[PDB]
């Protein structure tokens, strides 16, 4: 799989990229999903848009998510609802009161009609709770990921999550959860960005990345930042090729494509190789 995100501020500029052809290839042929993460939980069980006025609060609408999912139709990418903790930062307490035995169903059941709602084609997980991480936390995050993976199933739906890329921290989700959550995803961003390369060292090595996915590891995405030309010691070209090379995915954060590194026709071609068909192009 090959993700990207448009964040809920500098839309316009997301948007103007997702139309973006360099030199023949751009996020059309290399995507097959997008996931706008406009969405949070309120904490008692229900999810609302983003409301911080310094974001595109004229985008935070359901307009503008169908201006995403209709482009996204025309080549069978796949625009997922994509629900975050990370308006103000990194909040557990939003997601730990949503995912206790009280709220777990009624947030299930809030994250499925609002994708529903809108047509949309899974969802992205984007709750992160760093050094967060306890045995109740772990059971009911999972109970959590498992309801709603037996929901979106039965609706032909994807469901994808983002964690953090290491395992030897109390972070939750991190790389010490994958075990438990590859069956229940369709795939896993992990979120090492300049932290993780071919080069890096142990766990954070892609070779240990896909090591700690490998049960399944055609569902692991190294996540790649577009600000950055290069790092640990390689090219993003050479990043992505390594993906390529070794059967895993790419996740991009994000579609602001800041660096001209992600705008250049032989990383889009990569990762349409990665990325392979989806289906007939109706433009």
């Known amino acids: ?11 316009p500029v997301s948007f103007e990229n997702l139309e973006k052809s360099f030199d023949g290839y751009g996020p059309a042929d290399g995507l097959s999903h997008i996931a706008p993460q406009f969405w949070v939980p309120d904490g008692n069980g229900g999810i609302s848009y983003v409301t911080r006025d310094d974001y595109s609060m004229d985008y ?54 609002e994708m529903k709602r809108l047509n949309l084609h899974g969802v992205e997980v984007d709750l992160e709770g760093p050094n967060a991480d306890s045995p109740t936390d772990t059971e009911n ?28 921290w109390d972070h939750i989700p991190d790389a010490s959860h994958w075990p438990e959550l590859l ?12 932290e993780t390369g071919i080069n890096a060292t142990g766990d954070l090595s892609y070779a240990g990345q896909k090591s700690m996915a490998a049960g399944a590891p ?23 090729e390594w993906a390529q090379d070794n059967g ?35 433009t």
């Open 141 to 168: 995050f999972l109970l959590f990921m498992e309801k709603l993976s037996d929901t979106l199933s039965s609706l032909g739906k994807d469901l994808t999550i983002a964690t953090f890329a290491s395992r030897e």
């Open 60 to 113: 935070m609408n359901d307009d503008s998510v169908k201006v995403i999912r209709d482009w996204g139709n025309q080549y069978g990418i796949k625009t997922m609802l994509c629900i975050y903790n990370g308006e103000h930062g990194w909040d557990w307490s939003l997601v730990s009161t949503s995912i206790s035995a009280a709220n777990r169903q009624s947030f299930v059941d809030a994250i499925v009609t």
């Open 218 to 240: 055609e569902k692991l995405m190294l996540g790649m930042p577009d600000h950055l030309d290069s790092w640990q010691g390689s090219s993003a070209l050479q990043q992505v």
């Open 183 to 194: 069956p229940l995803v369709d795939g896993i961003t992990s979120m090492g960005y300049e």
């Open 1 to 11: 799989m090959v993700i990207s995100w448009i964040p809920p501020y500098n839309v």
């Open 248 to 282: 895993v995915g790419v996740a991009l954060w994000d579609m602001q494509l800041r660096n001209e590194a992600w705008q250049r026709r032989d990383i889009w071609k990569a990762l349409s190789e990665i990325r392979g068909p989806l289906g007939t192009t109706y």
